[PDB]
Amino acid sequence: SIVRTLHQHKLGRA
Amino acid sequence: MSYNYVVTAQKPTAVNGCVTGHFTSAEDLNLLIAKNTRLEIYVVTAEGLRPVKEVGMYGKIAVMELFRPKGESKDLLFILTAKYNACILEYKQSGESIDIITRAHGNVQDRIGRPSETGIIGIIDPECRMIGLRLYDGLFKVIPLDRDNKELKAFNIRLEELHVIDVKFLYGCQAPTICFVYQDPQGRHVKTYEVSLREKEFNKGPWKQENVEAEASMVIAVPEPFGGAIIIGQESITYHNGDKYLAIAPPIIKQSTIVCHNRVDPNGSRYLLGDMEGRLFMLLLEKEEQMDGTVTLKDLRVELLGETSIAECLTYLDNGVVFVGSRLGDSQLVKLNVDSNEQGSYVVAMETFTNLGPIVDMCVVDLERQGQGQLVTCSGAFKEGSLRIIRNGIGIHEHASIDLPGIKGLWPLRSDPNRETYDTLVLSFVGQTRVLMLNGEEVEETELMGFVDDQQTFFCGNVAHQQLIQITSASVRLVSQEPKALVSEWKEPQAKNISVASCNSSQVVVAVGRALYYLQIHPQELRQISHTEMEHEVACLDITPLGDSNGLSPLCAIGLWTDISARILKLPSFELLHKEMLGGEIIPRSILMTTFESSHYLLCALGDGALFYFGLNIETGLLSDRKKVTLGTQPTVLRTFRSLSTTNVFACSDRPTVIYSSNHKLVFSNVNLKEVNYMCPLNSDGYPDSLALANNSTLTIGTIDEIQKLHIRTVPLYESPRKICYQEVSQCFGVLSSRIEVQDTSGGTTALRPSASTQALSSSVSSSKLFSSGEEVEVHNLLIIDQHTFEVLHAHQFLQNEYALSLVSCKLGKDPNTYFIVGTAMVYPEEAEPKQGRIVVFQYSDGKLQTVAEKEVKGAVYSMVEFNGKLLASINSTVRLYEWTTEKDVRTECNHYNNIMALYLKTKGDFILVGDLMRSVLLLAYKPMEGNFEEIARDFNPNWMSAVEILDDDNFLGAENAFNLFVCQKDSAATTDEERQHLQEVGLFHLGEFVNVFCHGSLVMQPTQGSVLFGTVNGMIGLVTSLSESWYNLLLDMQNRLNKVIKSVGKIEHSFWRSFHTERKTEPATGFIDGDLIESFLDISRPKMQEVVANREATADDLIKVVEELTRIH
């Protein structure tokens, strides 16, 4: 799930 | 050849770090809050926090620790930026002005280095021999803390263990000793090394390496009494020391990750523990007495204290008070109680601090119908999630408003000595005085006793002794409260009249041309005292109760007429103390000294629109600091008001403002009104606690808004908001949200709390039947938020495992309805890439959401924009352009597919567009006739994109995962197969913020071109505009000049700050203006201003025109 990893960035995460 | 300009609109509000100690002085307890590029210094008080000092740094604060080197009275501040700027900082008060000085600095960045996972760790050893730095894998860096080393030289010490999770220096240790958990194959461990600085070696530590939990991630070093290391991991907590080992695993702390700790009592008996759910724990060290041995550790324990906002930072203070630094939500100040309340909560909120959080998306609307932009963000996440409505300026609420022309002044007036409410506010017409007999409902034109309807009032305050005072043009008159008859009067021995009033509640301290008297209205008469004469004609006056006076007032402010001056006397007195030449040729119009809260100033409004302000003092009598600031284009008129506890100044002019103050530095905020000529505070009958307002040719009364430059609304959601669109015809917002649910006993999913999508007024679920062939899950929804009430009118749920990624609101082709549309994806934890997903076409004509069209796709619809009445959209590296049949369906047009993950789309209204991930960017046109996509140009850099925007036809703006901005342009030269095929990065600049959304609009509207707003992970709002070559160059020039002038905290070079920086490369900034820097030109001293005008003309007064003009872009 790149989708996840992706969104996490938007929240400023790993 | 690209010219751009970035300013901050709203500072970063997310809290990144926070430390407590003795930095201001030793008798003093401070709290330093790190935001990003900003540092906040408070003093802990019985009530909360004393704001003392806020500065900026030229870098992102990445380590922030306080320490005490040998023989130092107070603490020093260690700071390390993400670009590897290290400095030691000191707090120095000298004067009444504060300065944050650099004891030492240097850049500690290495050429050999791969920035480890878990980023930078900065630790300091307990004896202050050294600072330990973990910047890259396989190395440990060391900056020795001997009183030399002002340049901060360092050595590295090859670290055998190349994957460290966390490290601390151990207490109660003979040599500097580290303690750290690391991962290899075989699992995770703890190891210890001593650090010898004579040797630059890593020597065997004091105790053998043990294994710790697979998820161990936090290392706390316990102070000398116990002196060991606690190790926090999922499921498990454990103390280690020499040959001691202790281990609790309470099943309460398994639900959610512990992410932050803090020490409560200095000996290490009790700690705080911050959880990803927002739950606060107390970790308790059961200490146990021998008689002789040393005090030991008996047992470990955890108490669930309650719930805070999701803590990133945490710090205990004085006496049960804990500061909660949040990145995902509002920061707070909370109280810890020994006894729980109802629900078992030991925690109680005291204060809450606005965090515009991660701003995941946003848009601009004209909510209040006026041409002022309003910004509404998707903010926060999980339980902290929210909308925030953001407004420029101060607002006032309009009640009944009498269309009453030519008015000339007003004062807070009644008609009784009773009810603190008032029924008639006698003002002053064109040359005249009139009456408003008002029951607080409708007005009346019955004129009054002695207040001759053919003369004029200058001051009219609540004078005791049963009288309604009326210092008039002719000369002070008297009309009694009860008797209402003309009591006593004044008249000038010659044939002359009062020209300038000034009073409080028992005085008539006026001026006749150049003469200055003082006539006391005691029990209904007149009683003179002192008298002088001015060298010039008197323009304006100030006196009011200042110190401990009531009746007779102490000092004296005077604005004169030919020499253009403001002077400080006494009153009585009038003696000369300080004459300030204001220069130029416009006379002063109003003069004011005022109680802020604690400190005093002088303010003078010239008739041009400008205002000056100085460093006064209500007890001695002597001026100081100088500053100039323009408001209106008309003569400005001043007045004080108290709204909350505090007292500000309302300035009346064509651009009505309010004078404020942060710490005690001066702030100037707009008021959202047309024009305002006169004004006074109130407390009335038909219109209670309020403000009267005399305008152009109307009158008005209403209450008043917060304070700040920005107004902020806040609509809590208790779940993650992810995208937002406004639909005007529906007069509501569409908002994409996500909520978490856990595993059920029956394998199902439920929800930890009521969310906006569960508590929605009407609701609905997905009846699609396509995809059909201790555990966390995201349920995703599309919310329908009302435009005025911001209630959740409707909530549509999506299929299980369907994530909503994109959202638009538009008309399509010939259909005259507005659909909202959503682009989704089927996410399974296992699957690396979404194989399925859909675009869904909704209609909210009213009341409910109808599914109007559904369209299966073959990947994650990462984004979509409306085109030319078509539907442009990307799907897992593919850019399609759907058409909308008169038969209600989306049929495919063409699709571009040369790109790796197309995340972002924008449209040059017409037929051009951007898009392309990991690559960087790409330009693409739609050829009408061909019915086709033509790939026009491409930028060939490895920018991992986060946001994208078309500034114009030939300018494309983009934000990238490394806090840099850049601008691309298509080449303007021959050989259109090659050079017209590549696009040159014509602009480069390092922001220091992560950008999630750009979108065109502005907050100002009631020298620069265009307005692009942007929101950031830190809750910072920014703005980009365009410039001409000459402005750019004027500004470029002024920036270097300024760098030389402006002292920098730590002494970091502004050019180094703003440089483009990735892993691959480092460049000076190009085509970009740091508007924040340009703006800070107004803060520097008159000497330092001149320093940089030297060399059409060249003048400072001239430059502050240009900068004042730039400030109002946002």
Instruction: Report whether B670 contacts B394 (CB < 8 A).
Output: yes
Q: Is A11 on the interface with B (CB under 8 A)?
A: yes
Instruction: Report whether B229 contacts B179 (CB < 8 A).
Output: yes
Q: Is B722 on the interface with A (CB under 8 A)?
A: yes
Work out the number of other CB atoms within 10 angstroms of the CB of residue B1030: 10
Q: Is B118 on the interface with A (CB under 8 A)?
A: no
Question: In angstroms, rounded to a whole number, what is the distance separating the alpha carbons of residues B959 and B332?
Answer: 31
Cβ of A11 and B860 within 8 Å?
no
Q: Decide: helix, strand or coil at residue B1104.
A: helix
Work out the number of other CB atoms within 10 angstroms of the CB of residue B235: 15
Instruction: Give the burial class of B371: count Cβ atoms within 10 A of its Cβ; 0-12 exposed, 13-18 middle, 19 or more buried.
Output: exposed
For residue B666, what are the CA distances in angstroms to B221, B300, B603, B615, B648? 44, 51, 11, 12, 11
Q: Please give the backbone phi and psi of residue B1030, each rounded to the nearest 5 degrees, phi first.
A: -75, -45
Question: In angstroms, rounded to a whole number, what is the distance separating the alpha carbons of residues B858 and B836?
Answer: 5
- Decide the pairing of beta strands B715-716 and B386-392: antiparallel
Q: Looking at beta carbons, which pairs linking B284-289 to residues 24 or more positions away fall under 8 Å?
A: B285/B222, B285/B226, B285/B239, B287/B225, B287/B226
Cβ of A11 and B1017 within 8 Å?
yes
Q: Please give, rounded to a whole number of angstroms, the shortest distance from the CA of B1019 to a CA of chain A.
A: 11
Q: Is A13 on the interface with B (CB under 8 A)?
A: no
Question: In angstroms, rounded to a whole number, what is the distance separating the alpha carbons of residues B344 and B333?
Answer: 19
Instruction: Report whether B152 contacts B143 (CB < 8 A).
Output: yes
Cβ of B832 and A1 within 8 Å?
yes
Q: Please give the backbone phi and psi of residue B69, each rounded to the nearest 5 degrees, phi first.
A: -75, 155
- Decide the pairing of beta strands B637-642 and B610-614: unpaired
Q: Which residues of B61-88 are buried (b: 16+ CB within 10 A; e: fewer)?
A: bbbbbbbebeeeebbbbbbbbbbbbbbb
Question: In angstroms, rounded to a whole number, what is the distance separating the alpha carbons of residues B463 and B411?
Answer: 12
Question: In angstroms, rounded to a whole number, what is the distance separating the alpha carbons of residues B285 and B282?
Answer: 10
For residue B398, what are the CA distances in angstroms to B401, B650, B701? 7, 17, 6
Cβ of A3 and B996 within 8 Å?
no
Tokens 């403000």 belong to which residue? B691
Nearest partner of B707 among B666, B660, B740, judged by Cα: B660
Contacts of B829 in chain A (CB under 8 A): 1
Contacts of A2 in chain B (CB under 8 A): 832-834, 901
Instruction: Report whether B127 contacts B85 (CB < 8 A).
Output: no
For residue B193, what are the CA distances in angstroms to B170, B177, B181, B204? 10, 6, 12, 5
Q: Decide: helix, strand or coil at residue B170.
A: coil
Partner residue opposite A2 with nearest CB, options B722, B830, B832: B832
Nearest partner of B82 among B963, B1032, B1042, B1070, judged by Cα: B963
Partner residue opposite A3 with nearest CB, options B328, B360, B825: B825
Instruction: Give the burial class of B413: count Cβ atoms within 10 A of its Cβ; 0-12 exposed, 13-18 middle, 19 or more buried.
Output: buried
Instruction: Give the burial class of B702: count Cβ atoms within 10 A of its Cβ; 0-12 exposed, 13-18 middle, 19 or more buried.
Output: middle
Q: Please give the backbone phi and psi of residue B528, each rounded to the nearest 5 degrees, phi first.
A: -65, 155
Q: Please give, rounded to a whole number of angstroms, the shortest distance from the CA of B358 to a CA of chain A.
A: 6
Q: In which element (H, E) is residue B653 found? A: none
Q: Please give, rounded to a whole number of angstroms, the shortest distance from the CA of A1 to a CA of chain B.
A: 4
Question: In angstroms, rounded to a whole number, what is the distance separating the alpha carbons of residues B235 and B253?
Answer: 6
Q: Which residues pair with residue B326 across a beta bridge? A: B311
Furthest-apart CA atoms within chain A: distance in Å? 17
Q: Which amino acid is at B944?
A: W
Instruction: Report whether B310 contacts B383 (CB < 8 A).
Output: yes
Structure tokens at B229: 């290391």
Question: In angstroms, rounded to a whole number, what is the distance separating the alpha carbons of residues B894 and B933?
Answer: 7
Count CB pairs under 8 A between chains A and B: 38
Tokens 């600095």 belong to which residue? B105
Q: Cα torsion at B953, B955, B961, B965 (round to 10°)?
A: -150
Q: Is B860 on the interface with A (CB under 8 A)?
A: yes
What is the DSSP code (8-state) at residue B1100? H
Q: Which amino acid is at B44?
A: V
Q: In which element (H, E) is residue B91 found? A: strand B85-92
For residue B513, what are the CA distances in angstroms to B498, B510, B562, B571, B578? 8, 10, 12, 17, 21
Instruction: Report whether B579 contacts B534 (CB < 8 A).
Output: no
Instruction: Give the burial class of B728: count Cβ atoms within 10 A of its Cβ; 0-12 exposed, 13-18 middle, 19 or more buried.
Output: exposed
Instruction: Report whether B521 contacts B459 (CB < 8 A).
Output: no
Nearest partner of B1010 among B1, B9, B5, judged by Cα: B5
Distance of CA B1077 to the CA centre of its chain: 17
Q: Is B344 on the interface with A (CB under 8 A)?
A: no
Partner residue opposite B1017 with nearest CB, options A1, A7, A12: A12
Cβ of A12 and B994 within 8 Å?
yes
Q: Is A8 on the interface with B (CB under 8 A)?
A: no
Nearest partner of B630 among B595, B664, B657, judged by Cα: B657
Q: What is the CA radius of gyration of chain B?
A: 34
Contacts of B1030 (CB under 8 A, 6+ apart): none
Contacts of B846 (CB under 8 A, 6+ apart): none
Q: Is B776 on the interface with A (CB under 8 A)?
A: no
Work out the number of other CB atoms within 10 angstroms of the CB of residue B209: 11
Rounded to a whole number of angstroms, the distance between the first and last alpha carbons of chain B is 25
Question: In angstroms, rounded to a whole number, what is the distance separating the alpha carbons of residues B982 and B970?
Answer: 7
Q: Please give, rounded to a whole number of angstroms, the shortest distance from the CA of A5 to a CA of chain B.
A: 10
How was this structure determined? It was done by X-ray
Instruction: Report whether B539 contacts B589 (CB < 8 A).
Output: yes
For residue B141, what are the CA distances in angstroms to B136, B619, B1056? 9, 56, 22
Nearest partner of B581 among B551, B556, B559, B553, judged by Cα: B559
Cβ of A12 and B1018 within 8 Å?
yes
Question: In angstroms, rounded to a whole number, what is the distance separating the alpha carbons of residues B407 and B390?
Answer: 35
Structure tokens at B398: 């309009």
Nearest partner of B860 among B828, B892, B885, B833, judged by Cα: B833
What is the DSSP code (8-state) at residue B1044? H
Q: Is B185 on the interface with A (CB under 8 A)?
A: no
- Decide the pairing of beta strands B296-307 and B311-316: unpaired
Question: In angstroms, rounded to a whole number, what is the distance separating the alpha carbons of residues B866 and B883?
Answer: 11
Structure tokens at B973: 């030269």
Tell me how long chain B is: 1114
Q: Is A1 on the interface with B (CB under 8 A)?
A: yes
Instruction: Report whether B452 contacts B479 (CB < 8 A).
Output: no
Q: Looking at beta carbons, which pairs linking B75-81 to residues 24 or more positions away fall under 8 Å?
A: B75/B21, B75/B22, B75/B23, B76/B23, B76/B103, B77/B23, B77/B32, B78/B122, B78/B124, B78/B131, B79/B39, B79/B1050, B80/B108, B80/B120, B80/B122, B80/B133, B81/B57, B81/B1052
Question: In angstroms, rounded to a whole number, what is the distance separating the alpha carbons of residues B708 and B107?
Answer: 37
Q: What is the CA radius of gyration of chain A?
A: 6
Question: In angstroms, rounded to a whole number, what is the distance separating the alpha carbons of residues B370 and B592?
Answer: 34
Nearest partner of B827 among B886, B895, B762, B779, judged by Cα: B779
Question: In angstroms, rounded to a whole number, what is the distance separating the alpha carbons of residues B273 and B263?
Answer: 9
Cβ of B828 and A1 within 8 Å?
yes
Structure tokens at B859: 């990947």
- Please give the order of strands across the beta sheet that includes B932-938: B907-908, B912-913, B922-927, B932-938
Cβ of B328 and A1 within 8 Å?
no
Contacts of B165 in chain A (CB under 8 A): none
Structural domains in chain B, CATH included, are 1-14+356-392+710-1026 (2.130.10.10), 15-355 (2.130.10.10), 393-709 (2.130.10.10), 1027-1114 (1.10.150.910)
Q: Which of residues 896-935 of B touch A (CB under 8 A)?
A: 901, 903
Q: Is B317 on the interface with A (CB under 8 A)?
A: no
Q: Decide: helix, strand or coil at residue B589.
A: strand
Question: In angstroms, rounded to a whole number, what is the distance separating the alpha carbons of residues B156 and B251?
Answer: 41
Contacts of B1083 (CB under 8 A, 6+ apart): none
Work out the number of other CB atoms within 10 angstroms of the CB of residue B620: 10
Q: Please give, rounded to a whole number of angstroms, the shortest distance from the CA of A10 to a CA of chain B.
A: 6
The string of DSSP letters for B865-914 reads EE-SSSEEEE-SS-EEEEEE-TTS-EE---EE--SS------EETTTEE-
Contacts of B940 (CB under 8 A, 6+ apart): B919, B920, B982
Structure tokens at B272: 């705080």
Instruction: Report whether B439 contacts B415 (CB < 8 A).
Output: no
Work out the number of other CB atoms within 10 angstroms of the CB of residue B43: 17
Contacts of B51 (CB under 8 A, 6+ apart): B40, B42, B662, B663
Cβ of A2 and B360 within 8 Å?
no
Q: Decide: helix, strand or coil at residue B629.
A: strand
Q: In which element (H, E) is residue B705 found? A: none
Partner residue opposite A10 with nearest CB, options B827, B832, B996: B996
Nearest partner of B272 among B225, B235, B218, judged by Cα: B218
Q: Please give, rounded to a whole number of angstroms, the shortest distance from the CA of A8 to a CA of chain B.
A: 10
- Please give the order of strands across the beta sheet that includes B678-681: B678-681, B691-694, B699-702
Structure tokens at B354: 């606005």
Question: In angstroms, rounded to a whole number, what is the distance separating the alpha carbons of residues B1073 and B1079?
Answer: 11
Partner residue opposite B381 with nearest CB, options A1, A4, A11: A11
Contacts of B293 (CB under 8 A, 6+ apart): none
The CA-based angle B243-B248-B251, given to 5 degrees, is 160
Q: Is B995 on the interface with A (CB under 8 A)?
A: no
Tell me how long chain A is: 14
Q: Is A4 on the interface with B (CB under 8 A)?
A: yes
Instruction: Report whether B413 contacts B436 (CB < 8 A).
Output: no
Question: In angstroms, rounded to a whole number, what is the distance separating the alpha carbons of residues B897 and B97?
Answer: 61
What is the DSSP code (8-state) at residue B1097? -
Strands (E), B108-228: 121-124, 130-134, 141-144, 155-156, 164-169, 177-184, 187-196, 201-204, 210-212, 218-221
Contacts of B554 (CB under 8 A, 6+ apart): B543, B546, B547, B570, B571, B618, B619
Question: In angstroms, rounded to a whole number, what is the distance separating the alpha carbons of residues B592 and B605?
Answer: 9
Q: Decide: helix, strand or coil at residue B484.
A: coil
Instruction: Report whether B282 contacts B265 (CB < 8 A).
Output: no
- Decide the pairing of beta strands B38-44 and B30-34: antiparallel
Question: In angstroms, rounded to a whole number, what is the distance separating the alpha carbons of residues B860 and B396?
Answer: 47
What is the DSSP code (8-state) at residue B254? G
Rounded to a whole number of angstroms, the distance between the first and last alpha carbons of chain A is 14
Q: Which residues of B661-693 are buried (b: 16+ CB within 10 A; e: fewer)?
A: beeeeeebbbbbbebbbbbbbbebbebeebbbb
Cβ of A12 and B381 within 8 Å?
no
Work out the number of other CB atoms within 10 angstroms of the CB of residue B926: 22
Question: In angstroms, rounded to a whole number, what is the distance separating the alpha carbons of residues B441 and B888?
Answer: 56
Work out the number of other CB atoms within 10 angstroms of the CB of residue B875: 23
The string of DSSP letters for B780-799 reads EEEEEEESSS--EEEEEE--
Nearest partner of B861 among B902, B894, B810, judged by Cα: B902
The CA-based angle B650-B653-B657, given to 5 degrees, is 40
Strands (E), B583-690: 588-593, 602-606, 610-614, 626-630, 637-642, 647-652, 657-661, 666-670, 678-681
Q: Decide: helix, strand or coil at residue B402.
A: coil
What is the DSSP code (8-state) at residue B223? P
Structure tokens at B855: 């369209």
Furthest-apart CA atoms within chain B: distance in Å? 105
